Amino acid sequence: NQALLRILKETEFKKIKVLGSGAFGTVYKGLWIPEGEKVKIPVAIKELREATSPANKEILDEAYVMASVDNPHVCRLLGICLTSTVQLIMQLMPFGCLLDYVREHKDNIGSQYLLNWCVQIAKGMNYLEDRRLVHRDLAARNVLVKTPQHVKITDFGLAKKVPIKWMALESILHRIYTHQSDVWSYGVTVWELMTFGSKPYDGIPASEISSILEKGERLPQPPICTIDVYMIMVKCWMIDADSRPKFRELIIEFSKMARDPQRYLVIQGD
Numbered sequence: 001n002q003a004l005l006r007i008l009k010e011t012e013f014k015k016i017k018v019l020g021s022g023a024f025g026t027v028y029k030g031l032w033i034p035e036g037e038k039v040k041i042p043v044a045i046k047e048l049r050e051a052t053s054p055a056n057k058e059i060l061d062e063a064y065v066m067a068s069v070d071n072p073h074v075c076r077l078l079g080i081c082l083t084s085t086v087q088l089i090m091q092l093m094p095f096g097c098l099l100d101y102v103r104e105h106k107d108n109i110g111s112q113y114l115l116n117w118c119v120q121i122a123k124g125m126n127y128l129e130d131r132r133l134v135h136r137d138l139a140a141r142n143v144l145v146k147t148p149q150h151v152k153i154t155d156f157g158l159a160k161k162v163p164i165k166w167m168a169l170e171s172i173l174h175r176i177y178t179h180q181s182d183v184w185s186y187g188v189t190v191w192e193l194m195t196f197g198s199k200p201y202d203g204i205p206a207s208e209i210s211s212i213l214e215k216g217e218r219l220p221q222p223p224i225c226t227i228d229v230y231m232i233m234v235k236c237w238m239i240d241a242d243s244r245p246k247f248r249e250l251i252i253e254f255s256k257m258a259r260d261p262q263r264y265l266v267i268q269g270d
C-alpha cells in the first residue's frame with residue numbers, strides 16, 4: 001500500500017555517530033536530506049545485522065505494520081532503506097533513553113515524572129495488545145524520551161543473546177511470547193526505572209535465573225518505591241500468566257497513584 005512509510009535510498013542520509021547498540025542492530029545520528037528536496041533533517045538509524053530470512057521482503061510487509069501504529073506512546077516508523085542491509089531511520093529524539101537518561105538524573109528527578117512513565121509505557125502496550133502485536137523486548141533502554149514528560153515505546157515487532165533478565169518463565173523455558181509475557185517485561189522495566197537504571201540481578205548468571213524464579217526470588221523492592229506500588233511490580237511477576245495484571249488494569253491503577261505520588265514514592269529530594 002501507500003501508507004505513511006517513506007522509502008528512501010542510500011543517497012538521502014549518512015550516519016554521523018553511534019548512540020546505542022546491542023540487541024538486533026545498532027543506531028546512529030545520521031542526517032536525512034530528502035532527494036530532490038532541501039532540509040538537512042536529523043534522524044537515527046538501525047542497521048539490523050541479521051535475523052534469519054525466512055523472503056528478503058517481508059521486512060517490508062512489517063514496516064507498514066510499524067507505520068500504522070496510532071499511539072502517542074508508541075514510536076512510529078518513518079521510512080526505510082532496503083538493500084544489502086535494512087536501514088531503519090526515524091525522527092531523532094535528542095533526549096537519551098528512558099534507561100540512560102534517568103540514570104543521568106537520579107538526583108532531582110521526580111515522583112511524578114515516574115509515576116507516569118509507568119502509565120505512559122503501560123498505556124503504550126495496551127494498544128499493542130489491541131493490535132495483536134507483541135513486543136518481545138521491553139526495557140528502559142527500549143523507550144525513548146520525546147520530553148521528560150512524554151515517553152514512547154521503541155523497538156517492537158522486530159523479531160518478526162536474549163533479554164533473559166526481562167523475559168518471563170515460559171519465554172525463557174519454551175520460547176513462548178504473549179501479551180502476558182510483556183506484562184512481565186514491564187513490571188521490570190519500571191523496576192529499573194525506580195532504581196534509576198540498575199542491571200537487574202547484577203551478578204547472577206542469566207542461566208541461574210530460570211531457577212531463581214522457579215521459586216520466586218530476587219528483584220528486591222526499589223528502596224524509594226513504597227509498598228502498594230511493589231505489589232504492582234511483583235503481581236506482574238507471577239508464574240501463572242493468567243495471573244498477571246493486563247495493562248488495561250495497569251493504566252487505571254497507575255493513574256490512581258500519580259494523582260498523589262508524594263505518598264507512593266518516597267524520595268529524599270523533592
Ligand SMILES: *[C@@H](CC(=O)Nc1cc2c(Nc3ccc(OCc4ccccn4)c(Cl)c3)c(C#N)cnc2cc1OCC)CN(C)C
Nearest residue numbers: 019020021044045046088089090092093096097154155156
Ligand atoms: C539508549 C541509547 C539511546 O538513547 N539511543 C537512542 C535511540 C534513538 C532512537 N531509537 C531508534 C529506535 C528504532 C529505530 O528504528 C527501528 C524502530 C523504530 C520504531 C519502532 C520499531 N523499530 C531507530 Cl532508527 C532508532 C530513535 C528512533 N527511532 C531516535 N533517537 C534515538 C536517540 C538515542 O539516543 C540519543 C542520544 C540506551 N542505549 C543502549 C541505546
